[PDB]
Design a protein around this ligand. Structure first.
Ligand SMILES: [Zn+2]
Lengths: 286, 53, 191, 39, 139, 287, 50, 94
């Protein structure tokens, strides 16, 4: 299907504004709308979004309303302002992927035959990216239920347009990884990556709590992947692998050695260049 | 409208130019008497057929 | 008049396609709406109608819209197939009122019951219970020759109008081929 | 290299006040041009 | 904030610019450039322009309102485009020339050979010809 | 009787819409309506902005369409929250920030319906990284100038903080219209959901970047220092001569090994430090 | 009937001319080198739709 | 059954457990690999068969508890390597 879905900052912001605009109830309620955007070379881009009215009682989650006329009427407005953008999917806060959001996609399947739903939290206090993009994929089997239809995840990242980036960076003026070198990498990928790995691993452990207190009767497939995960663990570091590592870890140190030595020489010449400067100035002065 | 129409013409000083190519993708390309070319999208207050290159 | 908004609740059950009135209970339904939607309009030149299917699940065709022709045309291609889920049907119409146009329109929904109705009472009282809480009166019209007098809705409608709550009323039709015509007059007259 | 930078911050001493060309000349010229620009 | 003043001075670049020409640098922070409108202007160079590109006569972009170096464009041209094969190649072999070996050899030894075997000329000591005239009867 | 402390707060989101629409029609002058709420007799705050369809060819803001205005306004209310049109914005591609003759004429129309309407100009080309360039404006009455009495009745040193742009001053700045200070509202939920989201990655940290290609990159870079270093020797003897300004100008046509050599060294040390470090970090995380 | 015809002319008084030149090179996606066929060489942008 | 560390099934150790002669186990391993059901290589010098990936199967309720152990012993190892960098790289952060 689609390899990845890029979400522009404007759409991200128009969803936070939507929740606060209607979230006067306070306790809890999702918010659902319709996404707009365009894609090229099998890579989706989402730029604009508008709010579609949507209500649903909590009990017996098979009741909900989405205004088709509002979707059709408003899209006539957005089409006039910008013709390039056409409906591509829908969004909803829905932190936990509520169950009823598998027949809703059928409602929006009319306007976009291959639509994607992006769940974007409005109240994020976490470390991961707050944009999960799912696509509908169909396959019926004899294990789950006679009617089988499940979402498949597509990697999503926050994009940036030339005009939006100007505003986005102006709006922050709060913190930036200035001098983006060894300092940002040691923190933007190494430490953060470990944090994510732990959380995902902890997520797996939480599900495995079913061993004692069964929640679902062994999903079967989840176990299959977990078995493959363990086999894929790098082979014990005791064989010829250890020699290969040293022959490469040390090989990288020579370049570091050479780079440092060149750095010292240039640093020493720089001090000489400056030191002779003030000595010459002082000598002439007195 | 005539009051507004005369207002543009009321600026009597015109800049004589020679029509270069009466393109039909009913537009006109002119060459003012200052060695400047242009692409007037709308011909203006003149017929599109009375103007020959 | 009185700035009313009605949200029609159409029926398309599989046993609803038998013609015991004249052109089967599909044209009998289509003529029935025509004599109400136009009747629903023409009093206040700002009204609103919406047709909702009572098929297996949430099936809504046209939303809150002042136009009149959309509903009629949208009624076609509504060939009946399946069972009727009344209990979860009104609530869907219920939400449509909540997300309405300018809220200064009085809210009501006329029901178009039909092929054998299914309910367990008790819950129906709760179904009528909530709607009667929030400035809502429903209009279930007995039709399709359900059990005589439909003594399951009887415990339903009275709940809304209970405590001297004058409003919409249950309307029944003879099992014989009684043409729909203006026979529907209890709600339109004064309720 | 760390030591080298250690002696780098000593040399700077009273070397910041260095006007490029001048101050009065630029200001006077700008004011005259602005007055004529309006009319 | 230094990183913020650097990203704020770029406003002087802007889209609408007039391509000029670099003539000579008078001192650091200043230079002499020639505008395509036809003139020679004394402008001030931006403090972020890599001076390594400030070569002899080259392409430099000047601010519209007040001429001032704001970029260094890659080399280009207007009425001279290299022949990119396609249908714009001559389509004539050396075997289609009616036996002009002596003339054919001379052009080979003065144009084609130096480009390929450049290092040989230095080794022998000859100075490669720097342009060949082709004069003769009409046809 | 204005208060010369208007301080039109715009948004953390209305600005992005203004810029996106401005850049979309960069050659032309797109126009739209601002949906904000008056709060004080001293401040006017905008919350949301929606665009108006372009009439067609022509770089102008000639007129607004009444029917389109109503249709969208009557449609946003039923889902969002009611808002009243407080001003209109049109994007100047690269001219600057001011009001032209047509823009002034269109502006008095809005002021007629609403007394305190605010006109905004957004420039999508001049704004680059940290400067957005808006400079919202408003009209001054011709009667006052005929009367000669200065308007805005300044009662605080708040409006005279931004020096008017000379380009804007050439036009009817402080003559046919007066600028109003513009600031922004920012909250952590907005910021944390934008700053901590824009440039991030999920798992790229523990990726060893094509170990075969890594050393090849090192060889090419290091080999460049072999020739670069040699030119460094030739760049030290001829230096430290008379007229260093002459020396300074002498480095305007030829690569300077002093800076070029350092640039390569910087990339070399970080690439291996990161690349090497991930090697040991991975060797413990996975078995 | 003539009033409608006159209105058409009034709809053309707001359309201005455009300088004519030929593209020389494409520096980037939004930057071009164009020489107006009267005078100097300019680096100018490009309309998104085009 | 064998832990991933050893996985050095010898030719004899396979024939005995399947009732084949030593001079025939070779066709068995290829048959398994041909279908795509196990992955590995065959070394007919020391008479060894390497296995690297046996197709996953079902684990009723006890081998899944053991799977929990291998995640606890692994989450805690990754946890330690996180604070190690965070503590010795306090200056390089934020
Ligand atoms: Zn304007």
């Amino acid at each position: 299907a689609v390899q990845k879905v890029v979400v522009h900052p404007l759409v991200l912001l128009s969803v936070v504004d939507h929740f606060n605009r209607i979230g006067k109830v306070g306790n809890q309620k999702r918010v659902v709308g319709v996404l707009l955007g365009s894609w090229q070379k099998k890579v989706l881009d989402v730029s604009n979004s508008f709010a579609v009215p949507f209500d649903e009682d909590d009990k017996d989650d098979s009741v909900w309303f989405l205004d088709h006329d509002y979707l059709e009427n408003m899209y006539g407005m957005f089409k006039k302002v910008n013709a390039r953008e056409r409906i591509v999917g829908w969004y909803h806060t829905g932190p936990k992927l509520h169950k009823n959001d598998i027949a809703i996609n059928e409602l929006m399947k009319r306007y976009c035959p291959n639509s994607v739903l992006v769940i974007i939290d409005v109240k994020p206090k976490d470390l991961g990216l707050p944009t999960e993009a799912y696509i509908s994929v169909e396959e019926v089997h004899d294990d789950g239920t006679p009617t089988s239809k499940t979402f498949e995840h597509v990697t999503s990242e926050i994009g940036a347009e030339e005009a939006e980036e100007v505003g986005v960076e102006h709006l922050l003026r709060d913190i930036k990884d200035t001098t983006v070198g060894t300092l940002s990498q040691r923190i933007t990928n190494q430490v953060h990556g470990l944090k994510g790995l732990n959380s995902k691993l902890l997520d797996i452990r939480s599900y495995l709590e079913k061993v004692a207190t069964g929640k679902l009767p062994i999903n079967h497939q989840i176990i299959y992947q977990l078995q493959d995960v363990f086999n894929l663990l790098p082979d014990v570091s005791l064989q010829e692998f250890v020699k290969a590592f040293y022959l490469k870890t040390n090989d990288q140190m020579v370049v570091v050695y050479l780079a440092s030595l060149i750095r010292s020489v240039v640093a020493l010449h720089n001090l000489i260049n400056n030191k002779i400067a003030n000595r010459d100035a002082e000598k002439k002065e007195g | 409208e005539n009051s507004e129409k005369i207002k543009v013409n009321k600026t009597l000083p015109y800049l004589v130019s020679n029509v270069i190519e009466l393109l039909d993708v009913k537009c006109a390309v002119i060459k003012t008497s200052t060695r400047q070319t242009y692409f007037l999208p709308v011909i203006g207050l003149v017929d599109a057929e009375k103007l020959k290159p | 008049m009185v700035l009313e908004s009605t949200m029609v609740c159409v029926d398309n059950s599989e046993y609803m396609r038998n013609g015991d009135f004249l052109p089967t209970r599909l044209q009998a339904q289509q003529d029935a709406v025509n004599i109400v939607c136009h009747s629903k309009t023409r009093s206040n030149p700002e009204n609103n109608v919406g047709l909702i299917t009572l098929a297996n699940d949430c099936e809504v065709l046209t939303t809150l819209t002042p136009d009149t022709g959309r509903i009629l045309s949208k009624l076609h291609t509504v060939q009946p197939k399946g069972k009727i889920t009344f209990c979860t049907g009104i609530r869907v119409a219920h939400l449509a009122l909540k997300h309405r146009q300018g809220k200064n329109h009085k809210m009501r929904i006329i029901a178009f019951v039909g092929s054998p109705v299914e309910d367990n009472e008790k819950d129906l009282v709760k179904l009528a219970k909530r709607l009667k809480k929030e400035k809502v009166n429903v209009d279930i019209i007995n039709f399709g020759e359900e059990e005589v007098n439909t003594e399951k809705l009887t415990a339903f409608v009275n709940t809304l109008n209970g405590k001297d709550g004058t409003g919409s009323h249950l309307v029944t039709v003879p099992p014989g081929p009684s043409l729909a015509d203006a026979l529907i007059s209890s709600p339109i007259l004064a309720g | 290299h760390n030591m080298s930078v250690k002696a780098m911050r000593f040399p700077p001493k009273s070397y910041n006040k260095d006007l490029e060309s001048a101050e009065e000349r630029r200001e006077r010229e700008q004011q005259d041009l602005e007055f004529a620009k309006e009319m | 904030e230094f990183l913020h003043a650097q990203e704020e001075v770029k406003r002087i670049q802007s889209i609408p610019l007039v391509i000029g020409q670099f003539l000579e640098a008078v001192d650091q922070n200043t230079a002499i450039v020639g505008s395509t409108t036809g003139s020679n202007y004394y402008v001030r160079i931006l403090s972020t322009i890599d001076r390594e590109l400030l070569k002899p006569n080259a392409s430099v972009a000047l601010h519209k309102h007040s001429n001032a170096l704001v970029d260094v464009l890659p080399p280009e041209a207007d009425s001279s485009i290299m022949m990119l094969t396609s249908d714009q190649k001559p389509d004539v072999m050396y075997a289609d020339i009616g036996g002009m070996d002596i003339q054919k050899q001379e052009v080979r030894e003065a144009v084609e050979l130096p480009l390929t075997h450049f290092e040989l000329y230095k080794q022998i000591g000859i100075d490669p010809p720097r342009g060949v005239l082709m004069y003769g009867p009409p046809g | 009787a204005v208060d010369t402390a208007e301080q039109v707060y715009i948004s953390s989101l209305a600005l992005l819409k203004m810029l996106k629409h401005g850049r979309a029609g960069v050659p032309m002058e797109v126009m739209g309506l601002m949906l904000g709420e008056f709060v004080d007799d001293y401040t006017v705050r905008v919350i949301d902005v929606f665009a108006m369809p372009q009439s067609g060819t022509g770089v102008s803001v000639e007129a607004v369409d009444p029917v389109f205005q109503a249709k969208m306004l009557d449609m946003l209310k039923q889902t969002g929250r009611p808002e009243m049109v407080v001003g209109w914005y049109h994007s100047h591609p690269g001219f600057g920030c001011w009001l032209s003759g047509v823009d002034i004429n269109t502006q008095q129309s809005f002021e007629a319906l609403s007394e305190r309407a605010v006109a905004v100009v957004v420039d999508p080309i001049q704004s680059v990284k940290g400067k957005v360039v808006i400079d919202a404006f408003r009209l001054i009455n011709a009667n006052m100038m005929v009367l000669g009495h200065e308007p805005r009745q300044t009662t605080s040193n708040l409006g005279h903080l931004n020096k008017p742009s000379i380009q804007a001053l050439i036009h009817g700045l402080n003559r046919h219209y007066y600028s109003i200070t513009i600031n922004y509202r920012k909250n952590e939920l907005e910021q944390k959901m934008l700053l901590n989201l824009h440039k991030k990655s999920w798992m790229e940290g523990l990726t060893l970047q094509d170990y075969s290609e890594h050393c090849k990159h090192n060889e090419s870079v290091v080999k460049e220092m072999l020739e670069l270093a040699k030119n460094y020797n030739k760049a030290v003897e001829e230096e430290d001569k008379m007229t260093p300004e002459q020396l300074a100008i002498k480095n305007v046509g030829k690569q300077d090994p002093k800076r070029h050599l350092e640039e390569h060294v910087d990339v070399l040390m970080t690439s291996n430090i990161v690349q090497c470090l991930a090697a040991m970090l991975d060797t413990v995380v996975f078995k | 009937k003539q009033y409608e015809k006159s209105e058409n002319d009034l709809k053309a008084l707001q359309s201005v001319g455009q300088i004519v030149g030929e593209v020389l090179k494409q520096l980037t996606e939004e930057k071009f080198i164009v020489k107006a066929t009267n005078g100097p060489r300019y680096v100018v942008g490009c309309r998104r739709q085009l | 059954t064998r832990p991933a560390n050893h996985r050095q099934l010898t030719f004899e150790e396979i024939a005995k457990s399947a009732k084949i002669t030593v001079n025939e186990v070779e066709l068995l391993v290829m048959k398994a690999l041909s279908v795509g059901l196990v992955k590995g290589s065959i070394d007919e010098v020391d008479k060894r068969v390497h296995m690297t990936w046996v197709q996953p199967r079902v684990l009723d309720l006890q081998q899944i508890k053991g799977m929990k152990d291998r995640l606890e012993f692994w989450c805690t190892d990754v946890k330690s390597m996180e604070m190690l960098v965070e503590h010795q790289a306090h200056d390089i952060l934020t």
